[PDB]
Amino acid sequence: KNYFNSPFKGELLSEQVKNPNIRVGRYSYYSGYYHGHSFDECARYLLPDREDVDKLIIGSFCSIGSGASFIMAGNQGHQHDWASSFPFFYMQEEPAFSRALDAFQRAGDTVIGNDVWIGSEAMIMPGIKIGDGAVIGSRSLVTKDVEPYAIIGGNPAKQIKKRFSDEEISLLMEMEWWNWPLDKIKTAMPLLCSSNIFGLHKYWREFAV
Amino acid sequence: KNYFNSPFKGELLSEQVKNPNIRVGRYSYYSGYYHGHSFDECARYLLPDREDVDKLIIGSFCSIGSGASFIMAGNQGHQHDWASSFPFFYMQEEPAFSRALDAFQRAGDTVIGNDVWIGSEAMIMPGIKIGDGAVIGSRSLVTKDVEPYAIIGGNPAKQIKKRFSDEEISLLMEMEWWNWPLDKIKTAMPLLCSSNIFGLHKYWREFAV
Amino acid sequence: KNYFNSPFKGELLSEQVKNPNIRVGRYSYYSGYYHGHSFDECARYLLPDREDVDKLIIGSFCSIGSGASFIMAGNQGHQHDWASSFPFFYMQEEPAFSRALDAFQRAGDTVIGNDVWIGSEAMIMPGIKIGDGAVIGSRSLVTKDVEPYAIIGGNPAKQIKKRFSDEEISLLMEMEWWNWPLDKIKTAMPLLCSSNIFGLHKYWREFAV
Numbered sequence: 001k002n003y004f005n006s007p008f009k010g011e012l013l014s015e016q017v018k019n020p021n022i023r024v025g026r027y028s029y030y031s032g033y034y035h036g037h038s039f040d041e042c043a044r045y046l047l048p049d050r051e052d053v054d055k056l057i058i059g060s061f062c063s064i065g066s067g068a069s070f071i072m073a074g075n076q077g078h079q080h081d082w083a084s085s086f087p088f089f090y091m092q093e094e095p096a097f098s099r100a101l102d103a104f105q106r107a108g109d110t111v112i113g114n115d116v117w118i119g120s121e122a123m124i125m126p127g128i129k130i131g132d133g134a135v136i137g138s139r140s141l142v143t144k145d146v147e148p149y150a151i152i153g154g155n156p157a158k159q160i161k162k163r164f165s166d167e168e169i170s171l172l173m174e175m176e177w178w179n180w181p182l183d184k185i186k187t188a189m190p191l192l193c194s195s196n197i198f199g200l201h202k203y204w205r206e207f208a209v
Numbered sequence: 210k211n212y213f214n215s216p217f218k219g220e221l222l223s224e225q226v227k228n229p230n231i232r233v234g235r236y237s238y239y240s241g242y243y244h245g246h247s248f249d250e251c252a253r254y255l256l257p258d259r260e261d262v263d264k265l266i267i268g269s270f271c272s273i274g275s276g277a278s279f280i281m282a283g284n285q286g287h288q289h290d291w292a293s294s295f296p297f298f299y300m301q302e303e304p305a306f307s308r309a310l311d312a313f314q315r316a317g318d319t320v321i322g323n324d325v326w327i328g329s330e331a332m333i334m335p336g337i338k339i340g341d342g343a344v345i346g347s348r349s350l351v352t353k354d355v356e357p358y359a360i361i362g363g364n365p366a367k368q369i370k371k372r373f374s375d376e377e378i379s380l381l382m383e384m385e386w387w388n389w390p391l392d393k394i395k396t397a398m399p400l401l402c403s404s405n406i407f408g409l410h411k412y413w414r415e416f417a418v
Numbered sequence: 419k420n421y422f423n424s425p426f427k428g429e430l431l432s433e434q435v436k437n438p439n440i441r442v443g444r445y446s447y448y449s450g451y452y453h454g455h456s457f458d459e460c461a462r463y464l465l466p467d468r469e470d471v472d473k474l475i476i477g478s479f480c481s482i483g484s485g486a487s488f489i490m491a492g493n494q495g496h497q498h499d500w501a502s503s504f505p506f507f508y509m510q511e512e513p514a515f516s517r518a519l520d521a522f523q524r525a526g527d528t529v530i531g532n533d534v535w536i537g538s539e540a541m542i543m544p545g546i547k548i549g550d551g552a553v554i555g556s557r558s559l560v561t562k563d564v565e566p567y568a569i570i571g572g573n574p575a576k577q578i579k580k581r582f583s584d585e586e587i588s589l590l591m592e593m594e595w596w597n598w599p600l601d602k603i604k605t606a607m608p609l610l611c612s613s614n615i616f617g618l619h620k621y622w623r624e625f626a627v
């Protein structure tokens with residue numbers, strides 16, 4: 001049964017996420033009608049029962065399209081530098097594999113910043129960091145860390161351009177509007193819904209003491 | 210429940226399409242067994258209830274493989290040139306967002322020509338025009354308009370080659386066999402099932418007055 | 419209903435495969451929780467009822483991730499070198515198409531070697547041969563044959579690197595550990611779970627008469 005009533009509406013990550021090893025920021029949402037499942041299944045292979053695994057961390061004011069996925073569990077027990085990539089350690093039904101060593105290796109957390117737009121069916125590899133403000137094109141295969149405000153696409157994903165000038169990006173990284181009190185975001189809404197980064201920064205300087 | 214009985218058979222677009230904002234030509238079909246849904250769900254985010262949206266237009270004698278998708282609704286309410294890509298205007302459950310502006314922007318219709326082969330899990334971005342005779346490889350991410358008779362593939366999709374010489378393409382674009390009366394298509398079937406473009410054009414000149 | 423109980427466990431190919439035109443080696447498995455179906459549906463368009471079609475052959479000690487697919491049935495009745503790519507021969511419901519010729523062309527078997535790791539949602543095109551020891555990255559679109567021990571990724575897929583030196587690859591191709599009696603694999607398990615290719619080859623020379 002589809003978790004979603006409509007392709008024209010998602011649901012807050014904070015409302016649907018049940019895996020303890022996913023941490024999500026305010027207002028971020030997943031719109032998953034075309035793939036049926038809620039967001040937890042987007043975090044593939046993420047054990048929910050222990051601290052000693054790579055975690056998935058998502059910032060605030062993120063938009064995540066249908067069927068995006070975040071590949072967890074590191075190398076999933078496969079070490080291609082070993083003679084075989086086959087996970088003998090994980091097939092203990094076979095007594096002949098009893099002397100196997102565990103190939104599992106962590107990749108580090110997957111960290112998605114604030115104000116990140118993730119297109120439908122993008123797939124983020126293990127251990128990837130995505131900076132604030134990035135745009136991940138639909139169907140991107142994200143194999144490398146993504147700089148703040150980068151627009152990327154492709155398989156493998158490559159940076160196409162940045163959303164703003166370096167000077168504007170510096171202003172945004174300084175003001176961190178995604179952490180403002182809600183009443184300031186409410187007041188700033190006309191500027192947030194605009195290309196006027198300099199004006200948004202001017203408001204930040206006005207209210208921030 | 211799967212809309213399709215078999216992976217070895219599709220169904221005519223004209224028989225399955227119910228969205229009023231999808232227009233389809235004769236004999237074009239969708240073979241969707243491996244993704245379950247009928248063709249309407251291939252047109253993602255396509256509002257069915259109004260005239261003032263981008264429409265999906267598909268020509269005649271097109272073949273569409275399983276899970277191909279056509280991304281509609283323009284930018285879906287996200288403007289990356291604005292300070293935030295987050296669609297505040299669409300989260301009016303939050304009163305703090307009441308002053309938001311609508312970021313929505315149309316992309317233009319998605320237009321698929323005649324005699325177009327679309328491979329399984331190709332994904333066509335908003336506003337894309339695909340010329341007559343094109344071949345869209347499986348898993349293509351189509352980010353730019355496609356020339357008539359181009360064979361393309363990849364993510365992002367790139368033109369690999371064309372199906373015919375420029376001279377042969379000129380003959381095909383002149384004769385427009387996909388608009389012939391059915392009795393002419395019936396008579397031309399041996400030539401249509403052949404590489405004899407010059408002969409097909411000769412038949413067109415014979416019957417077209 | 420999901421064929422799989424868990425994303426953390428697959429099932430042996432030998433246990434789940436029912437299509438007579440799929441041949442699989444020992445211990446190879448498919449972990450398909452995120453796409454629901456058992457492995458047979460991974461082999462798209464593979465007729466089960468006759469000898470005169472391209473077959474899917476998979477070696478031993480292969481690991482196949484969720485939603486990987488192997489596109490069978492050659493050109494599926496579409497010949498882009500003909501005037502139309504539309505499969506008139508397959509729409510005999512329309513009497514006007516009765517003079518159509520069958521465009522179907524075989525591509526040759528799809529052959530996956532031993533000790534091959536196939537990432538989730540990789541898609542292998544018709545007729546492709548993948549050498550022993552290869553690693554197929556997640557979401558690869560595999561359009562060309564893959565050399566033994568190549569690590570590939572992308573759409574279209576490209577070779578990134580090889581797993582071992584040419585000298586080490588030569589040792590592995592000579593010893594063919596994937597065909598050893600199980601008692602030798604059991605004894606060699608510490609070396610198989612290691613980067614010590616030279617030591618594994620030394621054990622092979624010790625026991626092989």
Ligand SMILES: O=C(N[C@H](CO)[C@H](O)c1ccc([N+](=O)[O-])cc1)C(Cl)Cl
Nearest residue numbers: 007008009010031254282285299300
């Ligand atoms: O969920 C939301 N938007 C997503 C797009 O990110 C939703 O799927 C959607 C798509 C299209 C659209 N439209 O055509 O205006 C509106 C919402 C907002 Cl309601 Cl928060």
Ligand SMILES: O=C(N[C@H](CO)[C@H](O)c1ccc([N+](=O)[O-])cc1)C(Cl)Cl
Nearest residue numbers: 047049089090091092093424426427
């Ligand atoms: O036991 C579990 N996971 C273990 C680590 O505790 C690991 O992922 C695993 C998977 C399969 C397996 N096996 O085939 O027996 C053993 C451990 C469950 Cl919590 Cl998924």
Ligand SMILES: O=C(N[C@H](CO)[C@H](O)c1ccc([N+](=O)[O-])cc1)C(Cl)Cl
Nearest residue numbers: 117119135137138280284287289294
């Ligand atoms: O994913 C893409 N486009 C989507 C289609 O749903 C749409 O055009 C879009 C692109 C960017 C965006 N953003 O920068 O926030 C929002 C929607 C391309 Cl960037 Cl690959």
Ligand SMILES: O=C(N[C@H](CO)[C@H](O)c1ccc([N+](=O)[O-])cc1)C(Cl)Cl
Nearest residue numbers: 187188189190191199200202203206
């Ligand atoms: O406009 C500004 N301040 C005015 C008073 O000069 C007021 O405080 C204000 C701030 C923000 C705003 N907004 O984000 O829409 C509107 C008015 C600064 Cl951005 Cl210069």
Ligand SMILES: O=C(N[C@H](CO)[C@H](O)c1ccc([N+](=O)[O-])cc1)C(Cl)Cl
Nearest residue numbers: 216217218219240463491494508509
């Ligand atoms: O639907 C049709 N063909 C699609 C391929 O575009 C169908 O999925 C199919 C696939 C393979 C095939 N074969 O092996 O001959 C026949 C039909 C025709 Cl019946 Cl109109």
Ligand SMILES: O=C(N[C@H](CO)[C@H](O)c1ccc([N+](=O)[O-])cc1)C(Cl)Cl
Nearest residue numbers: 006008009256258298299300301302
């Ligand atoms: O009301 C609808 N769509 C509106 C435009 O009329 C637009 O897509 C939309 C989506 C979500 C929304 N919201 O969160 O309240 C508001 C409008 C339904 Cl027809 Cl999908």
Ligand SMILES: O=C(N[C@H](CO)[C@H](O)c1ccc([N+](=O)[O-])cc1)C(Cl)Cl
Nearest residue numbers: 326328344346347489493496498503
């Ligand atoms: O999609 C592709 N191949 C499909 C696999 O189902 C098949 O080989 C095919 C290719 C082209 C085609 N056509 O030009 O009409 C028909 C089938 C490659 Cl072109 Cl990426």
Ligand SMILES: O=C(N[C@H](CO)[C@H](O)c1ccc([N+](=O)[O-])cc1)C(Cl)Cl
Nearest residue numbers: 396397398399400408409411412415
């Ligand atoms: O073959 C041709 N005309 C013959 C008579 O000369 C006849 O009219 C015809 C036309 C088309 C055809 N076909 O498409 O198979 C067969 C015969 C022209 Cl293509 Cl030169």
Ligand SMILES: O=C(N[C@H](CO)[C@H](O)c1ccc([N+](=O)[O-])cc1)C(Cl)Cl
Nearest residue numbers: 045073076090091425426427428449
């Ligand atoms: O099926 C198996 N492994 C696959 C990975 O190839 C399974 O999906 C899996 C994934 C992650 C994992 N982990 O976190 O350790 C264990 C098994 C082994 Cl149990 Cl044979």
Ligand SMILES: O=C(N[C@H](CO)[C@H](O)c1ccc([N+](=O)[O-])cc1)C(Cl)Cl
Nearest residue numbers: 215217218465467507508509510511
């Ligand atoms: O009859 C079958 N397949 C035939 C070859 O025997 C071929 O794939 C096919 C598909 C569709 C079709 N049709 O539309 O009538 C005819 C043959 C079934 Cl076994 Cl799938």
Ligand SMILES: O=C(N[C@H](CO)[C@H](O)c1ccc([N+](=O)[O-])cc1)C(Cl)Cl
Nearest residue numbers: 071075078080085535537553555556
């Ligand atoms: O598919 C990939 N990574 C997977 C994510 O599940 C994982 O990092 C992995 C990569 C290689 C591998 N191997 O060489 O056997 C095993 C797991 C990249 Cl190689 Cl594209």
Ligand SMILES: O=C(N[C@H](CO)[C@H](O)c1ccc([N+](=O)[O-])cc1)C(Cl)Cl
Nearest residue numbers: 605606607608609617618620621624
């Ligand atoms: O270690 C070796 N032989 C020892 C005796 O010298 C013994 O036969 C053995 C072989 C393999 C092995 N293993 O794969 O772990 C352990 C001991 C050869 Cl690899 Cl040099």
